[PDB]
């Protein structure tokens, strides 16, 4: 198990929209903190239980990274039991969570000083996501108190809203990159690491 490509995800050139957060998996490699520490400008760290950075060399069976981009304040909502907007209709993590979430601010990694409007977010779908789930796709939200037929009809919205393209009003509206390093351990053969 050599050094992982773990550093490529953080130093990547593309990040999918939050509603289409990328669920990548890494296995059969040792993920050290020496793989990416030369550009340590990470705004926020959180971890529940031992982390690859806490133990330089540490192995896991199933390590999966949930990668996406979201504005500043809502980064607070990436935590078990959180509710509201992003935590209810774009991403959700189990209330019994044993993993890590890493958030770092950037305003030029999206290739624009006024941010991008290509990273959308969904508001309201009726019923909120419970643990890891995804049901968000380009579609028209129907009814809610009165039925309609397509488009933005009588009491019907478009589920996806776009972030701004004008200059940001501070870090609060800047596109923070977020990678949730949720990992789990289960009975498996060894020499699998993450």
């Amino acid at each position: 198990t050599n050094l992982c490509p773990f550093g490529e995800v953080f130093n990547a050139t593309r990040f999918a929209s939050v509603y289409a957060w990328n669920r990548k998996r890494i296995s059969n490699c040792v993920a050290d903190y020496s793989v990416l520490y030369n550009s340590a400008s990470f705004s926020t760290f959180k971890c529940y239980g031992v982390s690859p950075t806490k133990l330089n060399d540490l192995c896991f069976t199933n390590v999966y990274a949930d990668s996406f981009v979201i504005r500043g304040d809502e980064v607070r909502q990436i935590a078990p039991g959180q509710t509201g907007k992003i935590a209810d209709y774009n991403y959700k993590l189990p209330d019994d969570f044993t993993g890590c979430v890493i958030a770092w601010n950037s305003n030029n990694l999206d290739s624009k000083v006024g941010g991008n409007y290509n990273y959308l977010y969904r508001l309201f779908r009726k019923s909120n996501l419970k643990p890891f789930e995804r049901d968000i796709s380009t579609e028209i939200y129907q009814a809610g108190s009165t039925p309609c037929n397509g488009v933005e009809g009588f009491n019907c919205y478009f589920p996806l809203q776009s972030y701004g393209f004008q200059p940001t009003n501070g870090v609060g509206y800047q596109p923070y990159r977020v990678v949730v390093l949720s990992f789990e351990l289960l009975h498996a053969p060894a020499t699998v690491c993450g």
Partner: nanobody, 127 residues
Framework: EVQLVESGGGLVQTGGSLRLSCALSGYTFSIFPTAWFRQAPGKEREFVAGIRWNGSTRDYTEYADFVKGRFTISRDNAKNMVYLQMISLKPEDTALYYC?????????????????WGQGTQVTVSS
């Protein structure tokens, strides 16, 4: 807090025209729909009109069943206000007209879901 101020109304002759201006402050129209309701003697606050800014190029108008094809609803962001143009008045139109904005975006046609209520304006139809 979000403050809504209603201007216009008053007493107008039956069969005339009127324009109601609801100025909204404390927030800027981004996705929030604005609903015009009327409370009449013996009637609760029921849907009368609604306006929603899709946010791309176009505005969406909602007219109640008994007021369809007879009323107009428009809006201006620059002065963050909503215009309700009313024609061919009838006596039953007399009521207290409220303009309301939802605490979020939930529901476009629902009286109870709107948690901001203005001070309303009395409108009377009689010659």
């Amino acid at each position: 807090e979000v403050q809504l101020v209603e201007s216009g109304g008053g007493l107008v002759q039956t069969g005339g025209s009127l324009r109601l201006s609801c100025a909204l402050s404390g927030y800027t129209f981004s996705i929030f729909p604005t609903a015009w309701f009327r409370q009449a003697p013996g009637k609760e606050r029921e849907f009368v009109a609604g306006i929603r800014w899709n946010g791309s190029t176009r505005d969406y108008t909602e007219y109640a069943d008994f007021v369809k094809g007879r009323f107009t609803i428009s809006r201006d962001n620059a002065k963050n206000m909503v215009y309700l143009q009313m024609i061919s008045l009838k006596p039953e139109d007399t009521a207290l007209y409220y303009c309301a904005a939802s605490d979020g975006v939930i529901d476009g046609t629902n009286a109870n879901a709107y948690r901001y209520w203005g001070q309303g304006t009395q409108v009377t139809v009689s010659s």
